């Protein structure tokens, strides 16, 4: 996998998958490994699932690819999510 | 530079179902989706219909859902339109254009129509 | 996701900077593109997510807005931009239209 930061917007709420429940995890992908990885790094990073925003992803029914987006804005409410998920990042790519 | 004709238009009587071609050169036609859409005369644009590279997944606009149906053919770099049950209000002008699916570095169907052909003109009367 | 304009009809003369409002009903961050039209031709596109410029539209365009309000500005009106103007994310706009005024 590989990671960008940008300002660019590839998924909505109201058009694809809202993950809230990593048994919703499953229709992401249609390879067990990269939702083993996927899962695998969001519990390395520290996200809550029950507990914090979701994040968005795309149905396996379509011939496009795999791609997960997500939000870590420094406004709002937003903000303090921020926090949290750039230390999750700090503490392991020993850079940032 | 890149070209796109369209063709198979003109006056018809309703009831009768109408295949319109759409020809493009010049890009590689097989990793770009397909939109077309129609323009009443005097009104603004609509999206009809809609089709991505592989073949597999199209979409339509409610208006026009369960008539309307789009083919490719990627050997013949061709595109194959067809309407059923027509009615008056489906007289318009229809075009069909390339869509752009990178934007920046990422591939989807973003909704974006960068060429365009002539324009057809299709006339349900009687 | 419905789409409205502001406003319906714009009058304005040779080297005017004019200005054009696109609401949506949700946000839909940055996913909106604006054309342009003639009459008796076909859609050029404008501006690629509100932001972005396609390669050979006059630099006198831009535009602007985030989330659900979005904003095309032109800051030099020439005589070949008299015209509609759409701004679309799902559907397009009901069409805003570019006007000599006298």
């Known amino acids: 996998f590989k990671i960008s930061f940008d300002d660019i917007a590839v998924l909505l709420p109201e058009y694809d998958v809202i993950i809230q429940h990593p048994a919703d995890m499953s229709w992401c992908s249609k390879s067990d490994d990269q939702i083993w990885l996927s899962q695998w790094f969001m519990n390395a990073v520290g996200h809550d699932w029950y507990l914090d925003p979701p994040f968005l992803c795309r149905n396996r029914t379509k011939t496009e690819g795999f791609i997960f987006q997500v939000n870590t804005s420094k406004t709002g409410i937003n903000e303090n999510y921020a926090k949290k998920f750039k230390t999750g990042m700090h503490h392991l790519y020993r850079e940032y | 530079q890149v070209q796109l004709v369209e063709s198979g238009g003109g006056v018809v009587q309703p009831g009768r179902s109408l295949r319109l071609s759409c020809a493009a050169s010049?890009?590689?036609?097989?990793?770009?989706?397909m939109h077309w859409v129609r323009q009443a005369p005097g009104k603004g644009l609509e999206w009809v219909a809609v089709?991505?590279?592989?073949?597999?997944?199209?979409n339509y606009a409610d208006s026009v859902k369960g008539r309307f149906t789009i083919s490719r053919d990627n050997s013949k770099n061709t595109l194959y339109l067809q309407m059923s049950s027509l009615r008056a209000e489906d007289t318009a002008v229809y075009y069909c254009?390339?869509?752009?699916?990178?934007?920046?570095?990422?591939?989807?169907?973003?909704?974006?129509?960068?060429?365009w052909g002539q324009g057809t003109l299709v006339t349900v009367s009687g | 996701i419905q789409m409205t304009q502001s406003p319906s009809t714009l009058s304005a003369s040779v080297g005017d900077r004019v200005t054009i409002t696109c609401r949506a009903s949700?946000?839909?961050?940055?996913?909106l593109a604006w054309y342009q039209q003639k009459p008796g031709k076909a859609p050029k596109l404008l501006i690629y997510?509100?932001?972005r410029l396609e390669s050979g539209v006059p630099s006198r365009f831009s535009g602007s807005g985030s989330g659900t309000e979005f904003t095309l500005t032109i800051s030099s009106l020439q005589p070949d931009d008299f015209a509609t103007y759409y701004c679309?994310?799902?559907?397009f706009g009901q069409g805003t239209k570019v006007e000599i005024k006298r």
């Open positions: 010049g890009f590689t036609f097989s990793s770009s989706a």
């Open positions: 254009a390339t869509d752009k699916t990178y934007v920046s570095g990422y591939t989807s169907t973003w909704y974006y129509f960068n060429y």
């Open positions: 679309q994310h799902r559907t």
């Open positions: 949700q946000s839909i961050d940055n996913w």
């Open positions: 997510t509100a932001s």
């Open positions: 089709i991505w590279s592989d073949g597999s997944n199209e």
